[PDB]
Design a protein around this nucleic acid. Structure first.
Lengths: 114, 114
DNA sequence: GTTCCAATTGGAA
DNA sequence: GTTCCAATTGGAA
């Protein structure tokens, strides 16, 4: 059987095969694995943790990214903080970085498309 | 005629009275107090952890900032990681933030002046 | 010695 | 269909 594991109070799930194979000793890698299991790469590339614009590029024409599903993010934070003993801030920083990483990859694939 | 405590292996010293009263329970607050004891405002407002420009502003001509004394910064990281059980990255982030904060205050006081 | 925060960036390893 | 880093920013609190 392919058993789904509930990772937090909002019942966001990942397969047991994924959950049991996460290295919970490295916060950032655990967070990245959950993210690519729960969200498609396109979502990660076009969304952010908070949905707020960067203060450093105010009055510009950068796309405004919407926030990732808050209930799913809350569950990821729940799981990683309880299993890695990291702070919520540490988990959120890993999500910010992963979203930025996926955005970079999307920009590359768009260049190919022309 | 006071005791100067060495906070790390490079022998960066602060007065014992300052050392004994630092808030070692909050990494960033300990770091900030060490910074204002060890460096003057002008230095904090015009220097950075690495002395390298931001990758986010390469097309702009932002003011250059020199690197804060590495021996002293290494000692600040030593002190805080040992007495607050923070990570080196956490301490360095606190330094980045304090430098940015003092740079902001310098700029504010200029507007205020004229 | 305001203090802390997260979005964006180029590029090393 | 990589991972991680630090400088800059406006603004919450």
């Amino acid at each position: 059987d392919n058993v789904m594991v509930s990772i937090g109070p909002n019942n966001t799930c990942v397969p047991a095969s994924v959950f049991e194979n996460i290295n919970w000793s490295v916060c950032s890698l655990a967070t990245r694995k959950l993210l690519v299991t729960i969200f498609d790469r396109e979502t990660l590339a076009t969304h952010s943790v908070t949905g707020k614009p960067s203060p450093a590029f105010k009055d510009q024409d950068k796309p405004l990214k919407r926030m990732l599903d808050p209930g799913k993010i809350q569950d990821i934070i729940f799981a990683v903080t309880h299993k890695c003993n990291a702070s919520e801030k540490e988990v959120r920083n890993a999500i910010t970085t992963k979203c930025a990483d996926e955005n970079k990859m999307m920009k590359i694939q768009n260049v190919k498309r022309r």
